[PDB]
Amino acid sequence: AVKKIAIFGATGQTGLTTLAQAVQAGYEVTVLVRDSSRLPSEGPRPAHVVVGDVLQAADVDKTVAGQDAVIVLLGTRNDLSPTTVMSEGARNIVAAMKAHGVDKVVACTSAFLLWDPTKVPPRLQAVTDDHIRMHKVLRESGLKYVAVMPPHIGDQPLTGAYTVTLDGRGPSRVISKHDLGHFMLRCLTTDEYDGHSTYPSHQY
Ligand SMILES: NC(=O)c1ccc[n+]([C@@H]2O[C@H](COP(=O)([O-])OP(=O)(O)OC[C@H]3O[C@@H](n4cnc5c(N)ncnc54)[C@H](OP(=O)(O)O)[C@@H]3O)[C@@H](O)[C@H]2O)c1
Ligand SMILES: O=C(O)c1ccc(-c2nc(-c3ccccc3Cl)c3sccn23)cc1
């Protein structure tokens, strides 16, 4: 079974609850954070903290070393400018996983990768472009890759009752951040989603 995991993006909206749920479930969690000040000071906390940047290959390498699996929840917070942080970060993660023999990566992009490209809101296209680039890096890596492609991420409660749609869009346009984190961790316990795109959604 999967015991040691690295989480990238652990200080973000979904990352923080994914981190808390992972520790609750008994995982030995390692995180790469740009600033440990953005990690919780009480409650569930990671077993190992690396402070550094996903754009520094040395920082990614020491985060991935020794893990059983990797969770990717990188993002740009509210910045919708053009970016390559997620795809370049993914390149470094793939290289580190290959060097260290880690084969399982669960990575969040967006449901827009499942949309008709004429329907993607132009204001979100620059971020979506790098989600596309990141997905390409991960799909071409040959690793056991679960492509998590959520719709809008909300702040509704944890339910564990969401629908998981494979290789297409699902019947709701929202997933709570807690349920998205729950699903990321579920993907560590099964291989049934490897090589698929997954769309978690629910009605709250
Ligand atoms: N908002 C939505 O409705 C929605 C819908 C579909 C998909 N998505 C996608 O889902 C993913 C996660 O969304 P989210 O809101 O949970 O993430 P988020 O709140 O934007 O947090 C992003 C995470 O990435 C980390 N990060 C950014 N640059 C980094 C770097 N250079 N080195 C190391 N870490 C770095 C941030 O660390 P710091 O604490 O240092 O900033 C933070 O932990 C994103 O890719 C987003 O585009 C979002
Ligand atoms: O299928 C859906 O209904 C759906 C999918 C994705 C999104 C989405 N929202 C954001 C966003 C919005 C405001 C501030 C920050 C961010 Cl990051 C981004 S960036 C890439 C995708 N998205 C919305 C709806």
Residues 6 or more apart from 41 whose CB is under 8 A from it? none
Domain assignments of the chain as residue spans, ordered by start: 4-201
For the chain, breaks with the C atom over 2.5 A from the next N come after: none
What resolution, expressed in A, was reported for this entry? Answer: 1.6
CA distance 95 to 109: 19
Which CATH superfamily includes the segment(s) 4-201? NAD(P)-binding Rossmann-like Domain (3.40.50.720)
Amino acid (one-letter) located at 174:
V
Q: Is the CB of 34 under 6 A from ligand 2?
A: no
CA gap 179, 183 in Å, rounded: 6
Out of 96, 108, 148, 188, the active site residue is 108
Beta bridge partners of 23: none
| Method used to obtain the model | X-ray
Residues 6+ apart with CB under 8 A from 42: none
CA of 37 to the centre of ligand 2 (A): 26
Neighbours of 17 (CB within 10 A): 23
- Report which residue type is found at 151: P
